[PDB]
Design a binder for this molecule. Structure first.
Ligand SMILES: *[C@@H]1O[C@H](CO)[C@@H](O[C@@H]2O[C@H](CO)[C@@H](O)[C@H](O)[C@H]2NC(C)=O)[C@H](O)[C@H]1NC(C)=O
Ligand SMILES: CC(C)CCC[C@@H](C)[C@H]1CC[C@H]2[C@@H]3CC=C4C[C@@H](O)CC[C@]4(C)[C@H]3CC[C@]12C
Ligand SMILES: *[C@@H]1O[C@H](CO)[C@@H](O)[C@H](O)[C@H]1NC(C)=O
Ligand SMILES: [K+]
Ligand SMILES: [K+]
Ligand SMILES: [K+]
Ligand SMILES: [Mg+2]
Lengths: 992, 268, 39
C-alpha cells in the first residue's frame, strides 16, 4: 500500500510557465474562474490531509483479555461457575465457594487487562501535526482579483501568492518572485533560507528554485505560483500519509512477554489435562474433577506476573523522567538496551543547529574557537594585536543584533535577528570581547555597502574610537580569495607587512584546510584611511566607490560550522563500545555530513571511503578495491537508483556509514534495510523529515527543545533537554531492566511449584488438602508482589556497557535455564518446606503422617463427625477443618519464609550476595511488608471467615527455616561454581 | 533431541537423580526429628478437639434420617451403620479379666489408672453391655438413635452443679456422676425416651479419663440410646440433642460441638 | 492437675492475635523507615 510512497517524486518544474498553464487549464495573470476552481474542487477533493483509520479503544482493551494467562483464568472462572451450577441444581449447598472464586478470578482477568493495556500504549497523532502545517487561509488570484480563501478550497491550477511570514498552502510552480527565500527544513532538516525564482535550476525538483512545497514557509520576499499538487498528493502530504500509515509492529520486550506466556501456558495445559485424566482413571467424579482442575489453573498461572512487569517498566520510566528523558510508551524503556544500530540525523540532533565560529587564521597561524554550548573547551588567544583588529572587523562589519530581553539567557543560546554567518560572528565576539553593542557605540558607522551578490563582500566606514585619531576606518568581509585580491599588506602580530607570495601561499594552505574541515570560510580586512585625504566632515558615497577598495590590509580568516553538541562525540564512542553500530542519515550536503561524522566519531581516524583511497593514490575510483574501504558516504541521488539488495550490501560491507542528502522516505528505507538484517534499530532525530524513520524505528527518540512537533509525535521517547548523553543512559537502563526482569520472573515463578505440588499429592496420596485455591492468590496477588517489583532496583552485577547487544533470536527473557532453576530446583525445595509444616501441624494435633495416607474420603465427609486420629481421639467435621485450614495458613507462611531466601538469591544471577550486598532498600521494604501482610492475614480477626486464615502458634513460623536456609546455601554454592569456572556446565545449565 | 545431545541428557539425569535423592533424604530427616519430639501416648496439642463433639450412629444423609415404615429397603441403609457401632459392643469381644473390667452398674466416679506411661501394661477399661440400651433389626417405625461423646485423652467430663436453675430442672439429678443428655425441638410433637447405664439419661463418669489408643486399645466409650416414639408422621422434625456440663460448650459454626441436629421424617 | 486439668485443652488465641498484630504493625513501620531513607 505504502510502497508507492517510499519512492522519490516526479515533477513538472521543467515545463515552461505557459506549458504549465495548459496542463492545469489556467491563466498566468488572471487566475482561475470562480466556476473553474469550484469545478476542480469537486473533481480532485479538498486541499486537506485525512487521518488514517484507527483501532478504537474498545477493541484494544478486549484484545488483552484473551492472552494466554487470561484465557486459562477464564477457563478457571467459568469452571468455578460450572461447578457452582452443578451444585445449585443437585445438593443444595449454602456455601459461597465456587461463586465467589469465580467472581474473584474474573476480576483478576479485568485488572490484569488494564495493566497490559497500559503497557501496550500507542500515543500517535502524526497526521494531526501535519494538518497544523496547512494555513487556515490562502491568497489566490481568481477572475483577475486577489482574495483570501479557506486554504482547503485551494485546487491544482489556481494562482497563489505568498510573502515573508506565510506558510506555503500547496505545492507550487514559481511563475514570479521578488527576493523570495523559503525555509525548506521540512524536506531537508536544514533551515538556511533557500531562494525561489521562476527559473528551473536543477533536474531534481527537490533542489530546483521554481518549486515551493507545502509544509514549508516563506521567510522573506514575495512570490506567485501555480498549484501543481493539493492535499495528499503534495510531496510532504505523501510523507504525512507514509508516516501516519506505517504499521507500528511488536516491540522486542512484547515479543519476549508473549514467548514465555506460551511456555507457561504450555506447561499449564500439559499438567492441567494430564492430571484431569489422572483423576478420572483414579475414579474421581466429574463434580470433583473440575475443582482440582480449577486449582491446577490457579497453581500454574502466575497471576501477578504481568502486572509486576508493567510496574517494573513504569518504575524504570520514572527514573528516566527524572533525567529529562520522557518515555511515551512503556515498552520503549527496554528497546534502547536491545538496540544494535542507531540511525541518527545530524542537524539539531548530533549538532546544535547553529552556525558557530570554529577556527581563525591570523598571524600565519590556525587557531581554534570553542564550539560547545556550555563552552567546555579553552581560550585560543587574547593577547595578539592582530586578534583585536580582526575582532573589530567581526563586530563592526556586521549587521546582526540580539533580540530584546535576552540578557537572562547565555550568549550561544539567545536568538539573533540576522543571517547565520553574521549571528555566528556576533556571538563569537560577544563571548570573548564582551558587549558588541559597546564596540558599535564607540565606533559609530557612517556609511556601509551591504553584502552583494555581485561584490561578494560587505564594507563599512566607522569613526575610530581612538581620541588621537577619531578618524575614518574602513572594514570589509567576504569571500576569502576576493578579500585577498584587494590587499597589499598583512597585519602580522601588530605591524603591517607586504603581501609576499610566501604569505599568499600560506593563506591558501590555511584556506584549503579550513574548507576541508567542511567549514564556511570568510576573509577579513581593514584599511586606516589617510588623514590628510579624509576630513572629519568628508562625505562618502556608497553608490559610487568614493574611496579606495584595493591595497587594503588583510587581517585574518574566520571559519564556521554547525558544530556538534558537547556530549555527542563521547556519546557516540560509548554507543560503539557497547557494540552498537552508529549510522548518520541526513538531508544535509555530503561535505558537511562527512566532516561532522569524523568530528563525532561516526568515522574513526584513518578510515577511508573509496573516494579517499582514489585521491590519495591518485588513481580512478574504478581501480580501487571497494573492500579496502571500511567507511562510505552515499548521496541521496545515488541511493535513489540502488535496489534494496544493493543497499543491504552497503550496510553489510561498511562499519562507518554516512547517508547524506537523503529524503524522508530514504531515511525510512535505510532503517528498513538495517531491520531486514535482523537488527533492533533506534532512530534519533528532530525534524519533520525524520518522521517516517522515527515511526519505523524499533524505538524513535526525539529532541525535546530543538524538535519539531511532528518528530516528537513520531518518537517513543523525548530528550527534554536535548542531552544526547541520555541515549547512553537509556541503553544502560534498557539493559539493566532486561536482567532484572529475569530475576523478578524467576522469583515469581519459583513459588508456583509449592502451589502445584500440594494438589498433585492430594490426588496421588489421598491426604487432606495441604493448601487452598484462595491461599494461592494471597501469595501471587499479595505477598510476592512487593518483593517481585523490588528486583527492578537491582544494580548491574558487571559493566553491562562492556557487553555486546543481546541477540533477540537466541537471548530470551525466559529460557530453559530459568525453568530448570525455578521449577526444577528452588521451587522444589520450597514445596518440601511447605509440606513439612503441613505434617508438623497435623502430627502435633494428633494425626501422624503414616495415618494420613488415604484419609481424605473420611476427612472431607461432612457427616462423619467422629474421625479417629492416631491417638484414638475423635474429631467433628469443623474441628478437623480448622486444623486443615491452619495447615493452609502455615503452608502459606512457609512459602513466605522460603521466598525470603528466594528473594535474596534472585538478587544476583552471577555474583554473591556477599559481593553485591544488600543496598536495595526497596527489596528490604519488600521483606518486612511481605511478613507484615502474612502476619496480618493470620492474626487479624475475621480473616478466618473471609480467607480461611487461622492463627499460627509461634513455633509454626519456624518450620520452613531450614528449607529457607538450604535455598540460600545451595544457590550460593552453585553461583560459586559459575564464577570459579566460566567454562560452562553450571553456566549452560542454570545461568538464567 | 528436543533440547540437547545424548551425553547432555545423561548429565541432567545423573544430576536430578542425586539432587532429588538428597532432597528426599533431607525431607525424611526433618520428619524423623519432628517425630522424635512427640509422645507415643499423648498429642502435643489438644485445644482443637477441646470441647468434645456429640456423634450418633444413624449415618445422616445431610444431618437427616428420612424413611418409610411401610417400606423394607427405606431403613436398611440406616441399620447398617447402626449395626456397625453396636456390633463392637459385643460380650464375646469383652472376654476375661484382660483387658476388661466389671465396674459399677450404677454411674460412678472417675478412675485414674496412674499416668500416661508405659510403666504398666494395657490400662483396663470398664465393660459396657449393649443390653443396657433398652428397646434397642432396630426401630422400624419411630427410630432408636444411639449417641456418643467424642473420646479425648485425659478429659474428665464434669457435669454442671445444681446451684441455680437447670433445663431438665433437677429431674433424676445424679449430680455427682452423670453427664446429662436432653433432646428438644414450642414445636413439641415428639416422645422423649432415654436409655443408658443404670437407666440414666447420661454418660457414666467411671469410663473416664480416656488413656488413648496406644495405652487403651479395645477400650469402650459409654453409649446413650434415644428413642423418639412420637405420635406424629409425614413431616420434617428438627430435633437437637444437647449435652450439658462444665467442660461442655457449643459453636454457631460447629453444629456437632456437644450437640445433634437430627431431621427425622417417618414418611409412611 | 488430676481431675482439674482443663488447661491442657486451652489455648490463648486472644493474646496470640494481639501479639501477632503488634508484630505485624511494627514490621510494617520498620519497613516504611527503611524505604523512606531517601524516598
Ligand atoms: C456382634 O453382635 C451381634 C448380635 O446380634 C452378632 O450377630 C449375630 O450374628 C449371627 C450370624 O449372622 C446370628 O445368627 C445371631 O443371631 C446374631 N446374634 C447373636 C446374639 O449371636 C454379630 O455377629 C457380632 N459380631 C461380632 C464380630 O462379634
Ligand atoms: C512432583 C514431582 C514428582 C514432579 C517433578 C517434575 C520434574 C520431573 C520436572 C519439573 C521441572 C523439569 C525440568 C525443567 C527444565 C528442563 C530444561 C529443558 O531444556 C529439558 C528438561 C528439564 C531438565 C526438566 C526435566 C524435568 C523437571 C525436573
Ligand atoms: C420396649 O420393649 C419392652 C419389652 O422388651 C416393652 O415392655 C416396652 O413396651 C417397649 N417400650 C417401648 C417404648 O416401645
Ligand atoms: K500461581
Ligand atoms: K517507533
Ligand atoms: K507464583
Ligand atoms: Mg534535524
Amino acid at each position: 500500500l505504502d510502497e508507492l510512497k517510499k519512492e522519490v517524486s516526479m515533477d513538472d518544474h521543467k515545463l515552461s510557465l505557459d506549458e504549465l498553464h495548459n496542463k492545469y487549464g489556467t491563466d498566468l495573470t488572471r487566475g482561475l474562474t470562480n466556476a473553474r476552481a469550484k469545478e476542480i474542487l469537486a473533481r480532485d477533493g479538498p486541499n486537506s490531509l485525512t487521518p488514517p483509520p484507527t483501532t478504537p479503544e474498545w477493541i484494544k482493551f478486549c484484545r488483552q483479555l484473551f492472552g494466554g494467562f487470561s484465557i486459562l483464568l477464564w477457563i478457571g472462572a467459568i469452571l468455578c461457575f460450572l461447578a457452582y451450577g452443578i451444585q445449585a441444581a443437585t445438593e443444595d449447598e449454602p456455601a459461597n465457594d465456587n461463586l465467589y472464586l469465580g467472581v474473584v478470578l474474573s476480576t483478576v482477568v479485568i485488572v490484569t487487562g488494564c495493566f497490559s493495556y497500559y503497557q501496550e500504549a500507542k500515543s500517535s497523532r502524526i497526521m494531526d501535526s501535519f494538518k497544523n502545517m496547512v494555513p487556515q487561509q490562502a491568497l489566490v488570484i481568481r477572475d483577475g482579483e486577489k482574495s483570501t480563501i479557506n486554504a482547503e478550497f485551494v485546487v491544482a491550477g489556481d494562482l497563489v501568492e505568498v510573502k515573508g511570514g506565510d506558510r506555503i498552502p500547496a505545492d507550487l510552480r514559481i511563475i514570479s518572485a521578488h527576493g523570495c527565500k523559503v525555509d525548506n527544513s521540512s524536506l531537508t532538516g536544514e533551515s538556511e533560507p533557500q531562494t525561489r525564482s521562476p527559473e528551473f535550476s536543477s533536474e531534481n525538483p527537490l533542489e530546483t528554485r521554481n518549486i515551493a512545497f507545502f509544509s514549508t514557509n516563506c521567510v522573506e520576499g514575495t512570490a506567485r505560483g501555480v498549484v501543481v499538487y493539493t492535499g495528499d498528493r503534495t510531496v510532504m502530504g505523501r510523507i504525512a500519509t507514509l508516516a501516519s500509515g506505517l504499521e507500528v509492529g511488536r516491540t522486542p520486550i512484547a515479543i519476549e512477554i508473549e514467548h514465555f506466556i506460551h511456555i507457561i501456558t504450555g506447561v499449564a495445559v500439559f499438567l492441567g489435562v494430564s492430571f484431569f485424566i489422572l483423576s478420572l482413571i483414579l475414579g474421581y467424579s466429574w463434580l470433583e474433577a473440575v475443582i482440582f482442575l480449577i486449582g491446577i489453573i490457579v497453581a500454574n498461572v502466575p497471576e501477578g506476573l504481568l502486572a509486576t512487569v508493567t510496574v517494573c517498566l513504569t518504575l524504570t520510566a520514572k527514573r528516566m523522567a527524572r533525567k529529562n528523558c520522557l518515555v511515551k510508551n512503556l515498552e520503549a524503556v527496554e528497546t534502547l538496551g536491545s538496540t544494535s544500530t542507531i540511525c541518527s540525523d545530524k542537524t539539531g540532533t548530533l549538532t546544535q543547529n547553529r552556525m558557530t565560529v570554529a577556527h581563525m587564521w591570523f598571524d600565519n597561524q590556525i587557531h581554534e574557537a570553542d564550539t560547545t554550548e556550555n563552552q567546555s573547551g579553552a581560550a585560543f588567544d587574547k593577547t595578539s594585536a592582530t586578534w583585536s583588529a580582526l575582532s573589530r572587523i567581526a563586530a563592526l562589519c556586521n549587521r546582526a543584533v540580539f533580540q530584546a530581553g535576552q540578557d537572562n539567557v547565555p550568549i550561544l543560546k539567545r536568538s539573533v535577528a540576522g543571517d547565520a554567518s553574521e549571528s555566528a560572528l556576533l556571538k563569537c565576539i560577544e563571548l570573548c570581547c564582551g558587549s558588541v553593542q559597546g564596540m558599535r557605540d564607540r565606533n559609530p558607522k557612517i556609511v556601509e555597502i551591504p553584502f552583494n551578490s555581485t561584490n561578494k563582500y560587505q564594507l563599512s566606514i566607522h569613526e575610530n574610537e581612538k581620541s588621537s585619531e577619531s578618524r575614518y576606518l574602513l572594514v570589509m568581509k567576504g569571500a576569502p580569495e576576493r578579500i585577498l585580491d584587494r590587499c597589499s599588506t598583512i597585519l602580522l602580530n601588530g605591524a603591517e607587512e607586504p603581501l609576499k607570495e610566501d604569505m599568499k601561499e600560506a593563506f591558501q594552505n590555511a584556506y584549503l584546510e579550513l574548507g576541508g574541515l567542511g567549514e564556511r570560510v570568510l576573509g577579513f580586512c581593514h584599511f586606516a584611511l589617510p588623514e590628510d585625504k579624509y576630513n572629519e566632515g568628508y562625505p562618502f558615497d556608497a553608490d559610487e566607490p568614493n574611496f579606495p577598495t584595493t591595497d587594503l590590509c588583510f587581517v585574518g580568516l574566520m571559519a564556521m560550522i554547525d558544530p556538534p553538541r558537547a556530549a555527542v562525540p563521547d556519546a557516540v564512542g560509548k554507543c560503539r563500545s557497547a557494540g552498537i553500530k552508529v549510522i548518520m542519515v541526513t538531508g544535509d550536503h555530503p561535505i558537511t555530513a562527512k566532516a561532522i561524522a569524523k568530528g563525532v566519531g561516526i568515522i574513526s581516524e584513518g578510515n577511508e571511503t573509496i573516494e579517499d583511497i582514489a585521491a590519495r593514490l591518485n588513481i580512478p575510483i574504478g581501480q580501487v578495491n571497494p573492500r579496502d574501504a571500511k567507511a562510505c558516504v552515499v548521496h541521496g541521488s545515488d541511493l535513489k537508483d540502488l535496489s534494496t539488495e544493493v543497499l543491504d550490501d552497503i550496510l553489510h560491507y561498511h562499519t562507518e556509514i554516512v547517508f547524506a542528502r537523503t529524503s524522508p522516505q530514504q531515511k525510512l528505507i535505510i532503517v528498513e534495510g538495517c531491520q531486514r538484517q535482523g537488527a533492533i534499530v533506534a532512530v534519533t532525530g528532530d525534524g519533520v523529515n525524520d518522521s517516517p524513520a522515527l515511526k519505523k524505528a524499533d524505538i524513535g527518540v526525539a529532541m525535546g527543545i530543538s524538535g519539531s512537533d511532528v518528530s516528537k509525535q513520531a518518537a517513543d521517547m523525548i530528550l527534554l533537554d536535548d542531552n544526547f548523553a541520555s541515549i547512553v543512559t537509556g541503553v544502560e537502563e534498557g539493559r539493566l531492566i532486561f536482567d532484572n526482569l529475569k530475576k523478578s520472573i524467576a522469583y515469581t515463578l519459583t513459588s508456583n511449584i509449592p502451589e502445584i505440588t500440594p494438589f498433585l499429592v492430594f490426588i496421588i496420596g489421598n491426604v487432606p488438602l495441604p493448601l487452598g485455591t484462595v491461599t494461592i492468590l494471597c501469595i501471587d496477588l499479595g505477598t510476592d508482589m512487593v518483593p517481585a517489583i523490588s528486583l527492578a532496583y537491582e544494580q548491574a552485577e558487571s559493566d553491562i556497557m562492556k557487553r555486546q547487544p543481546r541477540n533477540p533470536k537466541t537471548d530470551k527473557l525466559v529460557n530453559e535455564r530459568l525453568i530448570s532453576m525455578a521449577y526444577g530446583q528452588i521451587g522444589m525445595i520450597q514445596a518440601l518446606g511447605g509440606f513439612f509444616s503441613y505434617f508438623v501441624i497435623l502430627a502435633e494435633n494428633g494425626f501422624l503422617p503414616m495415618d494420613l495416607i488415604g484419609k481424605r474420603v473420611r476427612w472431607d465427609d461432612r457427616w462423619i463427625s467422629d474421625v479417629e486420629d492416631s491417638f484414638g481421639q475423635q474429631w467433628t467435621y469443623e474441628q478437623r477443618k480448622i486444623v486443615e485450614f491452619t495447615c493452609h495458613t502455615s503452608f502459606f507462611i512457609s512459602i513466605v519464609v522460603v521466598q525470603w531466601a528466594d528473594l535474596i538469591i534472585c538478587k544476583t544471577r552471577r555474583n554473591s550476595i556477599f559481593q553485591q550486598g544488600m543496598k536495595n532498600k526497596i527489596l528490604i521494604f519488600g521483606l518486612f511488608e511481605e511478613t507484615a501482610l502474612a502476619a496480618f492475614l493470620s492474626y487479624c480477626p475475621g480473616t478466618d471467615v473471609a480467607l480461611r486464615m487461622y492463627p499460627l502458634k509461634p513455633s509454626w513460623w519456624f518450620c520452613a527455616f531450614p528449607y529457607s536456609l538450604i535455598i540460600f546455601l545451595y544457590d550460593e554454592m552453585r553461583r560459586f561454581i559459575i564464577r570459579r569456572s566460566p567454562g560452562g556446565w553450571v553456566e549452560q545449565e542454570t545461568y538464567y | 533431541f528436543l533440547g540437547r545431545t545424548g551425553s547432555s541428557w545423561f548429565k541432567i539425569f545423573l544430576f536430578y537423580l542425586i539432587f532429588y535423592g538428597c532432597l528426599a533424604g533431607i525431607f525424611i530427616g526433618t520428619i524423623q526429628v519432628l517425630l522424635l519430639t512427640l509422645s507415643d501416648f499423648e498429642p502435643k496439642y489438644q485445644d482443637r478437639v477441646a470441647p468434645p463433639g456429640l456423634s450418633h450412629a444413624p449415618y445422616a444423609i445431610k444431618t437427616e434420617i428420612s424413611f418409610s415404615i411401610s417400606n423394607p429397603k427405606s431403613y436398611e441403609s440406616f441399620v447398617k451403620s447402626m449395626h456397625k457401632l453396636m456390633d463392637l459392643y459385643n460380650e464375646s469381644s469383652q472376654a476375661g479379666n484382660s483387658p476388661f473390667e466389671d465396674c459399677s452398674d450404677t454411674p460412678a466416679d472417675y478412675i485414674k489408672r496412674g499416668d500416661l506411661d508405659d510403666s504398666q501394661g494395657q490400662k483396663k477399661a470398664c465393660r459396657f453391655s449393649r443390653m443396657w440400651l433398652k428397646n434397642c433389626g432396630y426401630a422400624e417405625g419411630k427410630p432408636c438413635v444411639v449417641a456418643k461423646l467424642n473420646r479425648i485423652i485425659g478429659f474428665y467430663p464434669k457435669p454442671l452443679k445444681n446451684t441455680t436453675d437447670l433445663p431438665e430442672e433437677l429431674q433424676a439429678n445424679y449430680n455427682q456422676y452423670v453427664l446429662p443428655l436432653r433432646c428438644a425441638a414450642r414445636e413439641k410433637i415428639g416422645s422423649i425416651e432415654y436409655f443408658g447405664l443404670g437407666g440414666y439419661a447420661g454418660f457414666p463418669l467411671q469410663y473416664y479419663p480416656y488413656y488413648g489408643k496406644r495405652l487403651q486399645k479395645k477400650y469402650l466409650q459409654p453409649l446413650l440410646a434415644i428413642q423418639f416414639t412420637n405420635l406424629t408422621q409425614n413431616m420434617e422434625l428438627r430435633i437437637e440433642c444437647k449435652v450439658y456440663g462444665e467442660n461442655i460448650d457449643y459453636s454457631e459454626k460447629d453444629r456437632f460441638r456437644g450437640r445433634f441436629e437430627v431431621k427425622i421424617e417417618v414418611k409412611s | 492437675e488430676g481431675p482439674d486439668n482443663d488447661e491442657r485443652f486451652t489455648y490463648d488465641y486472644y493474646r496470640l492475635r494481639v501479639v501477632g498484630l503488634i508484630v505485624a504493625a511494627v514490621l510494617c513501620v520498620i519497613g516504611i523507615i527503611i524505604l523512606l531513607a531517601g524516598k
